[PDB]
């Protein structure tokens, strides 16, 4: 499946629009989507809802780097062959993120 078939992939959605979808108070902590990065050409971003001890409802953004040789990572130590594999991995455990991925971002 191309990434575009995944319900968590929102392509060229802006960082701002992603926060609008994610900051809904109904969303469980760890609601997420994946999108193109607005600031790094070719890269992706993983946007995750959080409840911060100081800031309350908050959206965290993680940069997903792409290798021309194939593969994706947030940290170069932990590489995946696909965005689908990266999502599956972080859905199991936070492993450094603010929270594990729990919930595919609902639409409006
Ligand atoms: N802003 C993040 C890192 C980051 C940078 C860029 C990025 O892509 P975009 O510019 O589309 O949000 C995502 C995440 C941080 O403070 O750790």
Question: How was this structure obtained?
Answer: X-ray
User: Is the separation of the CB atoms in 74 and 46 below 8 Å?
Assistant: yes
Is ligand 1 within 6 A of the CB of residue 10?
no
What domains lie within the chain, and their CATH numbers?
1-108 (3.30.505.10)
Q: Report the C-alpha gap between 23 and 17 in whole angstroms.
A: 10
Q: For residue 101, which of 32, 36, 19 has the smallest C-alpha distance?
A: 32
User: Is the separation of the CB atoms in 87 and 45 below 8 Å?
Assistant: no
Q: Report the C-alpha gap between 36 and 90 in whole angstroms.
A: 18
Q: For residue 60, which of 46, 74, 73 has the smallest C-alpha distance?
A: 46
Residue 61: strand, helix, or coil: strand
Ligand 1 centre and the CA of 47: distance in Å? 9
Nearest atom in ligand 1 to the alpha carbon of residue 14 is: 11
Is ligand 1 within 6 A of the CB of residue 38?
yes
Nearest atom in ligand 1 to the alpha carbon of residue 39 is: 10
Burial grade of 86 (CB within 10 A; 0-12, 13-18, 19 or more): buried
Q: Which residues of 19-48 are buried (b: 16+ CB within 10 A; e: fewer)?
A: eebbeeeebeebbbbbbbbeeeeeebbbbb
Q: Report the C-alpha gap between 61 and 68 in whole angstroms.
A: 22
């Amino acid at each position: 499946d191309s990434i575009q078939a995944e319900e968590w992939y929102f392509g060229k959605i802006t960082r701002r629009e992603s926060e609008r979808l994610l900051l809904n108070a109904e969303n469980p902590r760890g609601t997420f989507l994946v999108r193109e990065s607005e600031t790094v050409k070719g890269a992706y971003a993983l946007s995750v809802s959080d409840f911060d001890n100081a800031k309350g409802l908050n959206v965290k953004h993680y940069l997903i780097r792409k290798l021309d040789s194939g593969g994706f990572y947030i940290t170069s130590r932990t590489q995946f062959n696909s965005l689908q594999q990266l999502v599956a991995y972080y859905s199991k455990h936070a492993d450094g993120l603010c929270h594990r991925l729990t919930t595919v971002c609902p639409t409006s």
